[PDB]
């Protein structure tokens, strides 16, 4: 276990205060669908027609 | 029949009115479609290639919507009655040359406003009466205006005998006094003519005229002998050719704008208006306003044609459907 931990590097701080770091992510999205409705506002069932 | 547009005009033919989108089977079948809340109105029409839908009309942005009876678009053919006035002389005076003039406002092939004349000569002798004068003046007019040499006269000449008083006796460049054997001719009528029409090249158009009489000496005084009164028309020119051109032009707003330009490399559009039928028209002017900062109006119009059968049945049903759907209060014909 010592040879295990002696592999990872060590980093020195100045205090024992909570530190945080910023995380950078991704952009390209697509939006789900809650539902759809006809021209009269009725909801589209799964057995419905075109 | 290139026209002026409030940024667009679209034409759809109501060859048949159907109740649902499923019944659109033949080209020309149409159905007005509006939601139950009556927020938008649109039309589903069967083109030769599948059903097409019109633009959607926000029923709050409708500027006006009126329909026509197909009698408003008809052009009555103007016809005068020529006669020598009993004031100067109730019968021709010998030795004097009677020269009649037909003052046309355009040439035969042009539409620009010009002065264009055609003449008719008659020289009166000791025994010539009124009948013989009208006869010879009519034949002179025919031989002078019916020198078309390609197509057709510019006006039509007839004679009325006092016995008939209603039966126009036609006169052509071939007629001769031997064919005209009456003795009670009392006037000459000169009607307008339906000029050549081509679908998208030659618009329907007429050339009005006025019978003008030159001066004769009767008692040493130069005087005018004629009476060019305007009797009521009896013939008409329907809108079939006029509507067909409307379609030809307004189908380039949703279809192909070129029409024969790159003749081998073209797209040919099928047209559903039957030139020869009489259509009663409907029109709906509306606009699109837009969002924040975009208040400028894009005004538009959708017009619909339908054959008239006397009573404007087809259009009356079409508007009844549109009023039932969009709640509008369009008036019937």
Curated annotation (Swiss-Prot), chain A:
Disulfide links within the chain: none
Subcellular location: Virion
Additional detail: Displays an HK-97-like fold with an insertion domain that protrudes at the capsid surface.
Role played: Capsid protein self-assembles to form an icosahedral capsid, with a T=9 symmetry, about 77 nm in diameter. Each asymmetric capsid nonamer is covered by 9 capsid auxiliary protein, 1 copy of the trimeric head fiber protein and 2 copies of the dimeric head fiber protein.
SUBUNIT field: Interacts with the auxiliary capsid protein (via FD region). Interacts with the head fiber dimeric protein. Interacts with the head fiber trimeric protein. Interacts with the portal vertex auxiliary protein.
Record's protein name: Major capsid protein
Organism: Bacteroides phage crAss001 (Bacteroides phage PhiCrAss001)
Whole sequence portion shown: 52 to 101 of 504
Swiss-Prot record, chain B:
Keywords in alphabetical order: Capsid decoration protein, Capsid protein, Virion
Keyword flag Transferase: no
Subcellular location: Virion
One GO term describing the cellular component: viral capsid, decoration
Main localization, broad class: virion
Taxonomy, superkingdom: Viruses
This protein's record includes keyword Chloroplast: no
Chain residue ranges for the region called FD: 75-237
Domains: entry comment: The central region FD is structurally similar to Helicobacter pylori flagellar cap protein FliD.
Subunit structure: Interacts (via FD region) with the major capsid protein.
Job description of the protein: Auxiliary capsid protein that forms an outer layer on the major capsid protein protrusions.
Protein's recorded name: Auxiliary capsid protein
